[PDB]
C-alpha cells in the first residue's frame, strides 16, 4: 500500500495473507468470508503468462496477522487449503476480467483478530458503489512502486467515475471491475501495490454499521501514479458464482 498508514490492531480481522510454502514468501492478500472460506483474486493463483498455477499444497493462508514478517504466536492462525476454485470465465488472457477465486480451508477459530467480512447484497452494492464514496484497502504489499512495511497498511480511497477509469488506461474495462483512487487535482494520494493484490476493498455500511467487501485488489499500472487508478473485482457482480461454489462444496 502506497501512502497509507499502519493498521490498528484488529482493524481488518478478515485480512488474510496468502503465503507460499517454499520459498516462504508473501504472495497476495485475501479475505475471510466464513470459518472455512477465503476470497482472493484469481490471478494470485493462476496466471499462465508468468508460469503461475498454484496447487493447494503449494500454499498456506495466515489469518489474524498484523506484522508482515513475524510469526505472531498465539494470535495468527495458519490454515492449509482443501481446494481452490477459480472463476470459470476468469480472463487471464486479456484483462483479468472476473478476477476472483475461493479457497476452502479445517475451520479457523474466530477471535479478536480473526472475524469474517460480509459480502454485499444488491441493495448495499447499489447504494455504496458510487463515484466519490470511499472504501478501504489493506495489505502488506510494497510501500512504493520503486520499501516494505513492518505491519499491515491501510488506505481509504474514493470510487472513481467509470468514464474516468476507462479513460485512464488502454486496457478494456468491464462491468466486473471498478476503479478507485484520487485524481491528480485532488491532492491526496494512495494505492495498492505489489503484494496487495487479492486483498479486500471494504466499505462500512452507514445503514447497519457492518463492513462489506465490495472489491478485490485486482490490477493497476504501476502504483500511485498520477492519472492512474487501481482496479478492483466487482464482488457483488460475481456473487452468484461465489454462492454456487459455497452451496455446492461448502
Amino acid at each position: 500500500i502506497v501512502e497509507g498508514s499502519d493498521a490498528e490492531i484488529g482493524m481488518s480481522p478478515w485480512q488474510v495473507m496468502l503465503f507460499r510454502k517454499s520459498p516462504q514468501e508473501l504472495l497476495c492478500g485475501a479475505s475471510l468470508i466464513s470459518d472455512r472460506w477465503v476470497l482472493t483474486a484469481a490471478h494470485c493463483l493462476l496466471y499462465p503468462p508468468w508460469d503461475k498455477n498454484f496447487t493447494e499444497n503449494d500454499l498456506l493462508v495466515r489469518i489474524g496477522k498484523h506484522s508482515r514478517t513475524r510469526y505472531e504466536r498465539n494470535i495468527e492462525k495458519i490454515s492449509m487449503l482443501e481446494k481452490i476454485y477459480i472463476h470459470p470465465r476468469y480472463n487471464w488472457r486479456e484483462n483479468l476480467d472476473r478476477d476472483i477465486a475461493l479457497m476452502k480451508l479445517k475451520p479457523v477459530a474466530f477471535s479478536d483478530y480473526i472475524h469474517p467480512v460480509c459480502l454485499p447484497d444488491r441493495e448495499t452494492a447499489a447504494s455504496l458503489l458510487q463515484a466519490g464514496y470511499k472504501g478501504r484497502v489493506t495489505g502488506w504489499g510494497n510501500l512504493k512502486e520503486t520499501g516494505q512495511p513492518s505491519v499491515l497498511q491501510v488506505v481509504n480511497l474514493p470510487i472513481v467515475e467509470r468514464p474516468v477509469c476507462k479513460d485512464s488506461t488502454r486496457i478494456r474495462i468491464t462491468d466486473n471491475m471498478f476503479c478507485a483512487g484520487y485524481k491528480p487535482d485532488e491532492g491526496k494520494r494512495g494505492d495498492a501495490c505489489e503484494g496487495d493484490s487479492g486483498g479486500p476493498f471494504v466499505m462500512k455500511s452507514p445503514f447497519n454499521n457492518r463492513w462489506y467487501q465490495m472489491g478485490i485488489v485486482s490490477w493497476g499500472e504501476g502504483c500511485d501514479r498520477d492519472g492512474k487508478y487501481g482496479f478492483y473485482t466487482h464482488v457483488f457482480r460475481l456473487k452468484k458464482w461465489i454462492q454456487k461454489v459455497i452451496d455446492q462444496f461448502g
Binding site: 517454499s22 516462504q24 514468501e25 498456506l60 513475524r70 510469526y71 495458519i78
Partner: peptide, 11 residues
C-alpha cells in the same frame, strides 16, 4: 525475510 513458521504447518 520472514520468520520461520512452525514445522507443523509445512507437513
Amino acid at each position: 525475510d520472514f520468520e520461520e513458521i512452525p514445522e507443523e504447518y509445512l507437513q
